[PDB]
From a paper:
The asymmetric crystallographic unit contains four identical monomers with solvent content 48.45%. The four molecules of PcaF in an asymmetric unit forms a tetramer with an extensive buried surface area of 21130 Å2 which is 2.5 time larger than that of PcaF dimer as calculated using PISA (Protein interfaces, surfaces and assemblies, Krissinel and Henrick, 2007). The monomers B and C have a continuous density for residues −2 to 400 unlike A and D subunits that lack density for residues 212–215. Each monomer is comprised of the N-domain (residues 1–119 and 256–278), the C-domain (residues 279–400) and the loop-domain (residues 120–255). PcaF active site architecture comprises of N241, 325F, S162, M163, M294, S253, V255, H356 and I145. In the case of PcaF, it is occupied by S162 where the residue is flipped away from the active site cavity and consequently cannot act as an anchor. As hypothesized in the degradative thiolase PcaF, an interconnected network of tunnels with a long continuous channel running across the dimer is revealed using the program CAVER. Thus, the tunnel sizes of a single monomer (monomer-A) were independently calculated using CASTp wherein two major tunnels were observed with surface area 154 Å2 and 235 Å2 respectively. The second tunnel with 235 Å2 surface area is located near the covering loop. In PcaF, the covering loop is formed by the loop-domain residues ranging from 143 to 163.
Residue numbers in the entry:
A (entry chain D): 1 to 211, 216 to 400
B (entry chain A): 0 to 211, 216 to 400
C (entry chain C), D (entry chain B): -2 to 400
The structure:
Amino acid sequence: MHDVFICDAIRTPIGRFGGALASVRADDLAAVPLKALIERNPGVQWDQVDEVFFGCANQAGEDNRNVARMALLLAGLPESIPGVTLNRLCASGMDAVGTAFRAIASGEMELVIAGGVESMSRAPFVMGKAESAYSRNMKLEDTTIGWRFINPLMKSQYGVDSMPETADNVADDYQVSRADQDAFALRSQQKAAAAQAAGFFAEEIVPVRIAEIIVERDEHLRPETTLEALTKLKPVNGPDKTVTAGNASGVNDGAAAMILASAAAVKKHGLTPRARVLGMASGGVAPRVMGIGPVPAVRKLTERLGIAVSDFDVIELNEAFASQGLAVLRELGVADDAPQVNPNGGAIALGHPLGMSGARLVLTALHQLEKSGGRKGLATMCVGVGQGLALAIERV
Amino acid sequence: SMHDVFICDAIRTPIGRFGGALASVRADDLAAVPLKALIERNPGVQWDQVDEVFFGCANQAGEDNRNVARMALLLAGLPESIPGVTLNRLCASGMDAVGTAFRAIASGEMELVIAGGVESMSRAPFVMGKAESAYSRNMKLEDTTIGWRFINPLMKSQYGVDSMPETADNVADDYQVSRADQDAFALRSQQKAAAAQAAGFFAEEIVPVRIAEIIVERDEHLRPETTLEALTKLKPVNGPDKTVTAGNASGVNDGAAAMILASAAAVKKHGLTPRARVLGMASGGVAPRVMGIGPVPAVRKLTERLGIAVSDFDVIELNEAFASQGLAVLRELGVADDAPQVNPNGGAIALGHPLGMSGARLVLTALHQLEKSGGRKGLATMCVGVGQGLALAIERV
Amino acid sequence: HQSMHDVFICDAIRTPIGRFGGALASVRADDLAAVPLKALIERNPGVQWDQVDEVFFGCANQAGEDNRNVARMALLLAGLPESIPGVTLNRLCASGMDAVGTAFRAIASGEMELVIAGGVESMSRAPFVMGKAESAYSRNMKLEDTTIGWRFINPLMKSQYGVDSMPETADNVADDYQVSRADQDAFALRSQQKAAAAQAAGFFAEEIVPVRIAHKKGEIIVERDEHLRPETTLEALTKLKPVNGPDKTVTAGNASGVNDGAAAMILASAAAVKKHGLTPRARVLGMASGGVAPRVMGIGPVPAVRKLTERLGIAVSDFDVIELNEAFASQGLAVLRELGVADDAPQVNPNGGAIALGHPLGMSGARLVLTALHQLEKSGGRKGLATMCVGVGQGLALAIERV
Amino acid sequence: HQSMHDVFICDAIRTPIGRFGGALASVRADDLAAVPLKALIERNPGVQWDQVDEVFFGCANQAGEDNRNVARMALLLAGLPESIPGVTLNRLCASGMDAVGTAFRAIASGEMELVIAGGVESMSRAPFVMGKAESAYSRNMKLEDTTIGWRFINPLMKSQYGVDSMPETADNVADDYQVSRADQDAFALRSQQKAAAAQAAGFFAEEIVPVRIAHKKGEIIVERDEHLRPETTLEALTKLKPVNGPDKTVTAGNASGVNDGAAAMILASAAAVKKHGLTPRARVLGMASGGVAPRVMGIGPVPAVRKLTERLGIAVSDFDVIELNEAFASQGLAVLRELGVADDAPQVNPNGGAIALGHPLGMSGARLVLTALHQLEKSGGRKGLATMCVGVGQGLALAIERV
Ligand SMILES: [Cl-]
Ligand SMILES: [Cl-]
Ligand SMILES: [Cl-]
Ligand SMILES: [Cl-]
Ligand SMILES: [Cl-]
């Protein structure tokens, strides 16, 4: 096995639906971090990149037909560089990092780029083909988020709960109160606003130029959030439920990318190694409670590595919904407000462009370890239709 | 330390023609067919111990949306505790699933996995971009069956957006592959596939698809009736001075395939029969305009790292997207146009090409053929739209 | 002051009526509309065609190949001179009849002398429609079928009037006017029996021009109406399930279908009859329209017939033929009952109706006029009434007298 | 009695005309059609509304929220009694004028006494259309825009007549009839100047019912026609580039645009005027249509005017107002020249026309009639002519006389 080092990493700001990045095609957006990596790392011989791996949950729109390859070509990497796109919905960008790790670890590759993209603003409508001449049964479905082309067999066996519905199932089954979710959301807003003001996100961000407007800041943050404002919101799924627009992430646009390399490649390309990847693990759960998916993923990873959850100096836990973030922490024995968890806030504040988020969590965990002087970091997130993914790193 | 990785049982659906025998089957349900078969066929496996299902799929806009690997494993009746992930390297997706599964076991992260691929090109949906402005008159529906959609003006101006048949004419022109040679290659594919079908070779690979019942059991795309004279009469797709025709190109098709990969420890624990060890996978990039010679850098990269000459392989499964690029690849790698180890059971010109499933089929058929021929090493390689190649090597145990 | 002019119907001709996705499904609406126009040209060689004042066509859809004024499209495709104007009318189900009555008013008022009136519908080829986005990045895009029934539903229409489907309104009529399932089925059976008899007798064949269809290995013709179910029995009708649920009454067997077809006829003043060597067959007496609640649209003919007969001073019982469109048996019976005509009165639909023959919306009303006249000629009757209901709650009625 | 009845236009009203995607773009076509109907109700409180015989509306599209007989949809949304029937006419650009003439013929022939005629178009909201698959798993699905222009093109129409866009036809007219770029631009400038003056004088305000629109922070009222470019100068028009290339003459500045609007007016027999307390303003004299080659559709008004004037015995020079639709300055001028009227004759479009005001197809023809009448009243003129061209090669003309 070879050690695998994460080197430079960079991301776009995250835009609101229909907001600052809505005019940027997914393929063009994915190319922005790749162009930045090139500019930032002048020792690299770019013809020696073995592969670009990108996560993307949609792939029906301008991200169609292997967006990783489209993006590397738009970014001006050589046409000799291959690319492949991953889809594990919400966890896609993290899967790209872990898959990139496995490829180097197994000695198949030396120098790779891993990232993720989503343009949920620009997600297309889809229409199935007619199954008979003169069919009257043609319909358009929205690919922005959630179920489309529903399978009756899936509905009858597992249900087709919307993501907020699953988050309410978790709140119910795991006993997570409305008040606890609102406090978690408020802390996310507060920590993200502080991190933004400190310039932490600015160090992770490459601005996007739109032909020229410059988009430099994450757009989704609500720094003025207060507990009173959150308490007044009506639950999405009816008055007896707990999940609201204020204690859940949104749909968003963004891209992120990072360099991974073997020891030999770090030396050859003049890279700065920042952390080594320890491992990645996945787990599956009932679709109806997909939010709890990180629990088996984290347990699998930590048991194989023999590292206690309490040993991590940062835990970046995706905040798809406060209810599931809290439920996961509670099962793993971590306090709802533990200082190592999401110290710069998370997706409730920052937004959630599905394919990008998992790459962002890895790069931000590493960034946070560097600033805090921490050693081990854990990134983990839930996945639609009942999965979890977890990835651990260690600063060098 | 690295672990050896063994391919065990492997199975596929038949390949359907566009709008043909499998056109009524949702891609997710179709992907679930080989999964259910692996379950029925391998009674010793403790199925709650599968670490991951990896599936290739090039489209993902239709009933294969939102991570078809996970959708299929749930529809196949595998426990909800088993994770799944879907890979897209267009034409090579299914082979990428196998190579990705291999790397997960080889690195010690997993012990028992399923790798496969699916495509329902019959059912590929139309797509329409959202309006960029209120009352926009610029709304357009685009076919996702095959080829470019949502064309990026910057891709077109830098690299061109040549259709797959256009890229195959570019390869024919640049590598000097004659119409006559292309037609001869296509005839050989038809004759070899027809012979393999008759010998029951494909039946050993095929699990039937049940449609609520009608049962689909046979590969539908083959044209055993093909003659050189009929091929010679066809007009080139892209105009009179070109060479690629419907008869020297593959088609658009439906199908799924899956196979078990396992560490030595998992082979023992689950009572599996190891059939080959995976040696490695490599990828390569080329200009989009000549995507069909993509396999050349991929094969050169893999063979140089493994220290195995191309001439050392006992079978070469080279995908036949187009006769022109099949021949160009062989010539570049120093292999005869009719070498007996290449595509001995025929290939995509006869069998069809459901993008996401094809690369998984090539791996499992290369293995099948090694067993039939008593061969040792096998190479599967294929081209990829927008200019890539992928290659994967196995050795029979 | 100026005297009103008498208006005569001369030759008339129709295509066969095709089943949805059936014999005429490959024929564009505009080309289909041109088929009876071409037949009229072939059939009447004394006519100086550059003297046609107007072509009026009914068409309920106009979103598909029938877009942008199908009347004008059809006349040009039929080879009529480009100097001839055309206009398309839409009163849904009654459009074809409205074309005839509108042509009649144009001649009666002295504005024209020689006109063609007809109707067309290709329901097979009716397209889907999609509204534009109201905002950038809208998630609210929808595709809707235009074959039949509501699309782009207005919330105010739904709250004030409802948006009942056509079969739902037929059930409302059956409920309100108390028309039994048994009576509906008996009516449908009589329609199939009478149409089967008329077809065997060659009655429809006298109305029909065949349609040429492009085909591998050489073009073929469609010669016969395709919708008829001559082998229908009471037992088979009784076994069908109601479309809207177990305690409803309207079924696929006691309702018309969705269908393809076109029809056209010449109307002329006395002077034009003389100039063009035409054979006048009937004088048009008048047309009237009526409105009713949308939820019971099938009863629309009742105010329309009352309006027309009271203005003309003719009792309903005085007509020798009544062609009442059979959108649904429930509404056909309800209309007859309100008007004091027996459920099986011999002068009503004597050659059957849309339950057997089918209902391509824009053509049906023209068909009813030409077939009423045809029947008057075969029976030696004098006065004819054609009437039909209209979606969203109307009725239309037109009276003719054989000459 | 057997004489034709005189037919009077009484009250008339219209919405402002909106730009594409502009001030009225959020109003559904059916709701927009209802706006002038609701105004007519408030404005004419002597009318017994359940005695209206028919509502006739022009509408060129009918695929969108205007589907399924917008006349009937609009009257129900306006709160008119459900007993009132309605019918929709399509002669493309001339639909709303055809509604008026058709309403006239219905009363003149003695079949009705009290009607509403009007027109509507919402080109902003015109939908996309998609043909059905003609085979299972068809890859040949596509969307076409119904905003304006050809869709579902028939290969036979293309081969025999061409499928020239409307600006291409306007260039053909400019070429064939020799209308210079300079003259087109001068005509366009006169239209803007006269419309700006009429607007400033409050002339359009007398024709307009304002439309209330909701915004986030409260409601606004759209009161004014949005299309006008009062800042237009010859120098500005001179710098525009021709739509169809450099030896061509038609530009965005010498052509109308695409637009949204609706209009309606009451027509009544003398007996209905007396019973419903109406104020008669003009008598309708008659309407005539004509056809020309599609490729020069802009010249269509010439046969139409010739036919109407010959039948009525009224010379073109006898009219105190001529409202000639300004689809394109090239065809406007060509028509005037063929009819023997000076390019800048003071009786022609005295308050400007569609280059300034915009052209919501189905509405325009109704607007021309009501504005001709309005102008006759202001100027003390007696007879008025409204005429316009039609896509695919027609013209329509309608004459009125102030009472
Ligand atoms: Cl989703
Ligand atoms: Cl493709
Ligand atoms: Cl309907
Ligand atoms: Cl148009
Ligand atoms: Cl005026």
